[PDB]
């Protein structure tokens, strides 16, 4: 069973460096090249480089010449990619990609998310969204000014929720959540969004007031 098991999510400050590992198993390690691919803004894939683990010899995309440093440890069957002097533009998902040296047939690792930012960890501000008629009512919570990602939004602990992807307002995240409930149920009973942010150890309930 071919496995390419990569290291975990990374968060770093600009100017810092990071080293991503790609543990291979279930085949002869030196027999295949190892490639590294960057995926950013969803749709943009770029080949960073490869390494032939047999020679230890490396080939680089021009664009990544001094950004990336691919090595292997032939003894632990592990490929590494080192990224240096990290910028905001380096935040992406990185994949190791084994390729057949003769056919270009490929097997991909699970990917590693890197986030480069100057921000220190910051808990969210959570603002209720109540309206200023109909048989259901939509309410929301605006989860503002937190770092890093991510947060969990839960409504009365428990379907009919939309959770919108976070966006980066000036070094800091914001996301909103909506819920649709019966008008007979609110304001007459309590509706609360709970926002958990692991990184800052915060859990906070905001009741939706009319």
């Amino acid at each position: 069973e071919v496995q390419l098991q990569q290291s975990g999510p990374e968060l770093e400050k600009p100017g810092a460096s990071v080293k991503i590992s790609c543990k291979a198993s279930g085949y002869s390690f030196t027999d295949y090249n190892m490639n590294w691919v960057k995926q950013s803004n969803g749709k943009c894939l770029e080949w960073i480089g490869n390494i032939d683990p047999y020679y230890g010899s490396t080939k680089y995309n021009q664009k990544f010449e001094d950004k990336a440093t691919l090595t292997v440890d032939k003894s632990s069957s592990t490929a590494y990619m080192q990224l240096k002097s990290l910028t905001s533009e380096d935040s992406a998902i990185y994949y190791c990609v084994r390729s057949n040296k003769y056919t270009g047939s490929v097997y991909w690792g699970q990917g590693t998310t890197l986030t480069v930012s100057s921000a220190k960890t910051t808990p969210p501000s959570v603002y209720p969204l109540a309206p200023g008629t109909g048989s259901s009512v939509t309410l929301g919570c605006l989860v503002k000014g937190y770092f890093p990602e991510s947060v969990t939004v839960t409504w009365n602990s428990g379907s009919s929720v939309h959770t919108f992807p976070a966006l980066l307002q000036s070094g800091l995240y914001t996301m909103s959540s909506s819920v649709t409930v019966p008008s007979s149920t609110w304001p007459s009973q309590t509706v609360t969004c709970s926002v958990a942010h692991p990184a800052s150890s915060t859990t906070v309930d905001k009741k939706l007031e009319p």
Partner: protein
């Protein structure tokens, strides 16, 4: 660098369709082309290598074709797992380069958005900020244009839009639009309007409140 132009960049399709994705290379690549799938919330899987050879565990309904500089991936009778992203990759020259991708999305019936507008909370106003929020929920197709209006006149600065992916239960889309102001700026004006244009209605859907 070899450029790979991939067509189309997204397409709404149906189960049982025959779908063709094209990949045009800026020079002949001698069949040194792969096709790749990324299913939603997953990594990548190789489908085809050297133009026309199926990777392992790829069903027969997938085929690749073409030569010189012009290549294509055909999915015969599209099945549920085939709702994914597809990419070509060139390996005739260094650097390897990729097509921009193709998303296959689920075609379904049109649905009007349910639109809701929200004034700033008291607590945020306390912070000096004022975020007006508009949800547009459970609409199809995905294309929707949003405008904010302050006292019947548009504002474009400080608007932040986030779209959902295709919904796992009704195949619709939803999005939020947030207009961020200072309290100062906010206090000056009275009427706040979120205005959506969408194929399901030849007039805008407007949602508004009064301060």
């Amino acid at each position: 660098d070899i450029l790979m132009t991939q067509q189309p960049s997204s397409m709404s399709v149906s189960l049982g369709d025959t779908v063709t994705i094209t990949c045009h290379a800026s020079q002949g690549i001698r069949s040194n082309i792969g096709w790749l799938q990324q299913k939603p919330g997953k990594s990548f899987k190789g489908l085809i290598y050297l133009g026309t050879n199926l990777e392992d565990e790829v069903p027969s309904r997938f085929s690749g074709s073409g030569s010189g500089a012009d290549y294509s991936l055909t999915i015969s009778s599209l099945e549920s797992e085939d709702f994914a992203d597809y990419y070509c990759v060139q390996y005739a020259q260094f650097p390897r380069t990729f097509g921009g991708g193709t998303r296959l999305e689920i075609k379904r019936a049109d649905a009007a958005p349910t639109v809701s507008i929200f004034p700033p909370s008291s607590e945020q106003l306390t912070s000096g900020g004022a975020s007006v929020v508009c949800f547009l929920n459970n609409f199809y197709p995905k294309d929707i244009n949003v405008k904010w209006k302050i006292d019947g006149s548009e504002r474009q600065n400080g608007v932040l839009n986030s779209w959902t992916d295709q919904d796992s239960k009704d195949s619709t889309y939803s999005m939020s639009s947030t207009l961020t102001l200072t309290k100062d700026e906010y206090e000056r004006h009275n009427s706040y309007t979120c205005e959506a244009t969408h194929k399901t209605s030849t007039s805008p859907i407007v949602k508004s409140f009064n301060r």
